[PDB]
Design a protein around this nucleic acid. Sequence first.
DNA 1: CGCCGCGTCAGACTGCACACAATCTAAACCCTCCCCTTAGGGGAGGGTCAAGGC
RNA 2: GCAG
DNA 3: GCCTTGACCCTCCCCTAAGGGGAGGGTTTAGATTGTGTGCAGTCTGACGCGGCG
Lengths: 49, 1336, 49, 79, 48, 49
Amino acid sequence: RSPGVFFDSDKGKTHSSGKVLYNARIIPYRGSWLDFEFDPKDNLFVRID
Amino acid sequence: EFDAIKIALASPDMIRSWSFGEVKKPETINYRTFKPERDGLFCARIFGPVKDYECLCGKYKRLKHRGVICEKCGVEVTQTKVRRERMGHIELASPTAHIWFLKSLPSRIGLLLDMPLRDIERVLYFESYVVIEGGMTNLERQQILTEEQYLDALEEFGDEFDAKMGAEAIQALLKSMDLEQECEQLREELNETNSETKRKKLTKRIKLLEAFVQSGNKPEWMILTVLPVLPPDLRPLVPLDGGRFATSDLNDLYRRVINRNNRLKRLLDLAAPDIIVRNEKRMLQEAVDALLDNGRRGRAITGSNKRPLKSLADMIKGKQGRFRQNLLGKRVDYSGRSVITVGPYLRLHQCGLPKKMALELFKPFIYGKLELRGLATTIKAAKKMVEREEAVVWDILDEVIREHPVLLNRAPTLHRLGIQAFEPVLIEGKAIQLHPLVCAAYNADFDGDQMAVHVPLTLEAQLEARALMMSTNNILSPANGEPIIVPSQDVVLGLYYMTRDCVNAKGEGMVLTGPKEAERLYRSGLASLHARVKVRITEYEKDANGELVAKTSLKDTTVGRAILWMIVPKGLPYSIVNQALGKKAISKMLNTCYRILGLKPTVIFADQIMYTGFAYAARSGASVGIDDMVIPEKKHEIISEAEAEVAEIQEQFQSGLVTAGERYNKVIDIWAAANDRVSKAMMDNLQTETVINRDGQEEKQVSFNSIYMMADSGARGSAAQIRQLAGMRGLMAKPDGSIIETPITANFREGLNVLQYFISTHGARKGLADTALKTANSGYLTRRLVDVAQDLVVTEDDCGTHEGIMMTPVIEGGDVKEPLRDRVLGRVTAEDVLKPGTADILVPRNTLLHEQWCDLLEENSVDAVKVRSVVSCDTDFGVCAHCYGRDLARGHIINKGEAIGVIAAQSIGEPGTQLTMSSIQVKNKGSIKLSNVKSVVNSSGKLVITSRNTELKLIDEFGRTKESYKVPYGAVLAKGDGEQVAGGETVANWDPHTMPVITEVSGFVRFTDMIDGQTITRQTDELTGLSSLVVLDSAERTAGGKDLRPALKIVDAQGNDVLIPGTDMPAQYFLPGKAIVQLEDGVQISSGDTLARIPQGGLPRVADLFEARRPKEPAILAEISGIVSFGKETKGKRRLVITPVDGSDPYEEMIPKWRQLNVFEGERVERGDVISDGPEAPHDILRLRGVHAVTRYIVNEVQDVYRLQGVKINDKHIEVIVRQMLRKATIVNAGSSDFLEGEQVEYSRVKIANRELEANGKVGATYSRDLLGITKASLATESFISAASFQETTRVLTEAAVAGKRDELRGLKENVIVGRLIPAGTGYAYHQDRMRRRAA
Amino acid sequence: GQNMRVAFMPWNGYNFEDSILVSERVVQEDRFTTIHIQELACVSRDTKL
Amino acid sequence: ARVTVQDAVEKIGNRFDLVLVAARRARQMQVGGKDPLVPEENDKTTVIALREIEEGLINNQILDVRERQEQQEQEAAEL
Amino acid sequence: KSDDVNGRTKMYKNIVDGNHQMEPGMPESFNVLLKEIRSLGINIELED
Amino acid sequence: SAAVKEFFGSSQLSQFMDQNNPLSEITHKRRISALGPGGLTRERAGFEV
DNA sequence: CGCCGCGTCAGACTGCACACAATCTAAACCCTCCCCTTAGGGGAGGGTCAAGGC
RNA sequence: GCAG
DNA sequence: GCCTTGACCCTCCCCTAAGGGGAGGGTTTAGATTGTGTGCAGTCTGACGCGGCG
Ligand code: 118
Ligand SMILES: [Mg+2]
Ligand SMILES: [Mg+2]
Ligand SMILES: [Zn+2]
Ligand SMILES: [Zn+2]
């Protein structure tokens, strides 16, 4: 997978409500991954590695 | 030798008693002279001598003085194999928690001290204190103190109280507890509160405390003060060839434990500051935790590879542990392997074994015969003789393989016909020559397949290979009963070509004296093999006594059917060959020979069929050319018309009249119609394209096309592949499943162009990857099924039970998917089945329904037979042979001692690689029947049902049911109850997009608290012209009538309460929101018209059926039979009540309101009625509808998956797995017994306990049987060896250890692990002798 | 590979289920005879004896 | 010789019991001087044992009473 | 055939003697397993 | 030198060459691999990749 | 008491071939104990060889 | 890396 | 034939005089330095259970 920012989803495969949950993911060539995502309550969260 | 296996915790004195000395140094060996160092991990003095009968310094060297301990260095003089047996021990400077009893959830040290795992971990990692006893102070026992709280409460309370930290503290707590006082206090605190999950936590802890009291285990032994050291020959430090060494990772882990232990002893002798000794105690705790189970607490210790170290727990756990890599299957001597190749000259019972493999697999046998016959003076001379391959060892070798069978095995051994014994025939090649008929059983093709040869050594193994496993004993499949040694591709094409008929074939119409004259004509060239002739055939019928009687008649046959008659055994009709024999006709011919004449003539018959099919397939020269794929000339016209139609739909879409959605849908459907028109034109042009002459006049016949003969014989391929050869290859699907809107209009006889080929690969790689990743999904299901059923053996002959399941033909809507005969062939009846004319017993009570009895049942019209099943069998620990029924592979009742659990699990799991990943129209005549009949007559004279579990069956004129549908509640039925109809007669009408409120009785409309504005929105539309109402939903109304729900009542024109028939309670319609009310208050409604309208697989399916996985949206069921009522709605989770007639009424629910409830208020329900709808959960089916109900549900829902894919598995095999799932019970009322309430016991245990209680008059326990999926039922066996070798070894072993379990080795995995005979089969007699000589 | 003369026909069971029935002239003519070269090493080491 | 054991299973109505009886008999004739009760047509002792089962010359009861008889006759060699 | 260390040599010399009879013991890998569970501080035994 | 030595000798992508015929060589060189260090694992690689 | 987060637990079977891991640091004192240096001596432990008598 |  | 009997004879272990050579173990080192860093992996999904937590 190329380095860059990749926007993806899980297509309602969580919380049984069929709610599509989005997440960006910054993937570098070397270094720490940085993800942003949505929870089922529509709150933007962030993960590092 | 030993009758059981006992596991338990290890006392430190017990550990010091295993050991032969303390390991004081990490020294493994010396580096210059590699002798083992003193007091090291490899010590000759502790663990015994490194050479056989030899002291380490060499002062004592021979077995003259054996067992003496050399006083110079204390190594004994004995065999060196004692280094595999003698353990040592490390005396830990500080205690150390055993990680298995600290971390394996639920934590036993946490469960015992009633202390959460985070507080325990904070105590032992030297972060917090804990007051091991308070005394006369305000500090209770388990109260943890942080540093400063302890620091001050020191000088407030002096040294009265005692608090500690570290595993010394946890050991002081575990030693300082009194178990019986705690368990009795837990019992009195149990009998006080009725909180369900708190009572369950208390019962968990009670069972743990009493398991510590029963067993000899002391709690404080969960904290290591002595460590055992594995014997050194099991963690070897061995010299490799290159002068380098190779070691086990346990030497690293033990070495680290010893280092940190010795440094801890030095820090204690130096009186280091306490930061340093605490750090060293944390590090010793870490090192012991890494030795026992690496990587469980935190981070794995990697050594010298950045690859984790393999700890003691990883040696015994997983796909690479001892249990699965070395105990349940192992590498085997006297075994070879080679490529398989055909050899079709063979008989059914023989394989071809190369001489070069047989000389090596049979080497001791040849040495024996070489010395016995005097050809070698010495076994060394014999070794040299077989090395030189002298000409006499080939005669000896022909002598020693003579009647000696070998086992041939092809992996994956999906089912028991994957290992079969054949007599060897020595051949010259290097490839095993496998007789063709057995290949279908092995799943073997000769494209590179290799098979493994094994040699039965003893006489018992030779007789089991002869008598149980020889391939002439396995001609029937253990799954369905159908023949598994059955002709295939070349044989069936030869026999189909032989038994066909051409119209004007050479030598037609002549009259023949018999099959021999037909063979003479055909070999002379004077008659074609397809010449329709008149031949005198003598055939024998089996008389009623059993003997054969002849009959002789000129039959109208062809020459080839006459030739084929010469190989047919005697007791068979001539009509069995007087037809064109495809694959199914030959399989039925073999089955007929088996059922009429038995095994011995069938084997000869099958070999004769193979030889004659091979021969006459060769004679035909049936070849595939490119002209055999005849493409219809109407293909280009069909495709051009379809392209015209799709272009019309496209330019209509430019006209906007259609959405892209229906444009796409219509383009797909008008290409699918083109694909079927092309396939019909192709097949019609292909299948009769022979038009030939009789007496000049042309006449069409079935085609002699090679492609069509191969498809039509069942030899290879189907019409679905001839479609892609000669028709078009149709619409493809994208990788995400959505099908591409333009098809591959081309076929493989033409070219696929580059784009169509790319589109083709889209789905071809999906199929190949599915195949690659579903074998691991099916093999794991098979493993789980074998491990849930491994210990089921037929142990009795008759349990004397009278129950059983009611077998009926399965009818899904309007067609039988499985007739009664296929479901009761071979089972044993449980009650007298009698004719539809009653009291005439057709079949007696305990008969095996073999084919004669099923033919008798089909002469009559019996539609249901109550038949013995294994879920209904009274035998505890096993099943009786009558409840099981027929042995599918022999065709008689099953012998006592058969391991039917492994057969059932292999029969279910072997086909697993073939699986993946409105109104009612009567079809044909019959009397209409309804069940759950509650009917009224509507305004128009129809019938309308007042029920929700009513279903519409169709009784035939003979008495049997031929279709059955399920009608929604209040469907209007155009045809009444008990009337005759014909094909297409639509009976029941409704609309699925809404649900009506059915009028109870005829009367006038009134509003019971249906307030204008509070419970409705008044609406006005112009299409019908009338005003109407909508009942208000939750979030759109006021306070008030959202709480008090709207109702409508029946009042006549006089103002009187009109009633329902039979009951004079007020009859109401309690309407929920989202309802459409288009009737007015005071309108006359006859009973039956609408008052309001409210709008609305594969291998994982089998896996989560047998795993009893609860569906995501479970259909709610009615627990107790009563009347529905409602509690606090609009909460987010409503509350429902059911009111019985003569029972305790209040029974609550937490039904979430976001799912439509499918019953109404006034009516009654019963146990099992679906309140809501959805996929049913098997636990609910078991609790509410019974045991036989969940049995019927599981077998129907698994056979639904296996019947799409055309797989024929019997239902015994699913009923066996269901019986092994219904193996536990939960005590609800303890009775006069020793079982506690609410604790889960083995079902046979509580059954024999009740039996001995009621034998002495006392009252027995009452139980609720439970449904555990195959994994949770495999891990809940009464044997920790079975459950520990299945999976989750750590949980099974810690639970069994603290409970002090005892494995009596009753199943088959425990007897395979210890190297004993299995208690099933030929080892069943020995185990019965063992249990009749030790119990007495 | 080599340009072999094939006939597509079932022959007496000997090409059942993907087997191939080769003539003897394919062996006389050394058509599919292939040379294979193995290297075998004998290592004289220094041992402690 | 032997290609199918089905006739011998009708005398000993089981396959597992047949295996055990024929193994006991085959060990009698193999390590033991006990000669066959049928003509030994170049057969191994497993197959001769089966060919004796098939003619009713051997079953568990027959082998048991022979064990009793010859055991009495050779332990009563009290001199 | 596999693990019995004393049973495999008895089986060999029995085959060479013309006596196709086994004297099976305990598989050695079961003994390895018992010693690898007893080194975990768990007393696993064989009850006579 | 040890970094490049372990890469060229011990990496998953540094493979023993197929040398059956010329086609095996020239198609082993034109080979793309989703696996390797920094890529997928053949067990955890899904259906969609 | 119902829910969300977190941890744990699984994930086909035989076969060939190949082949591990690769970085990573003190010196100057002293001591004891063992084996070695010549050209054979000394002796315990254990066989062997012609002779003789029974 | 591959074979079924 | 059955014995003895003195004379030989072999191997092997240790010893010589005055240290040499090495192995394998101890011990102190006095300007002053006072918190680990891989340019890591993190990338597997689904089921289940249990525990904080509102
Ligand atoms: C470790 C071990 C096996 C698998 Sb997979 C799998 C997983 C995700 C997506 C596709 C495949 C597997 C197989 C059966 C049941 C459950 C998981 C797998 C197994 C064998 C070969 C290739 C992939 C995954 C991790
Ligand atoms: Mg194959
Ligand atoms: Mg590989
Ligand atoms: Zn010694
Ligand atoms: Zn029964």
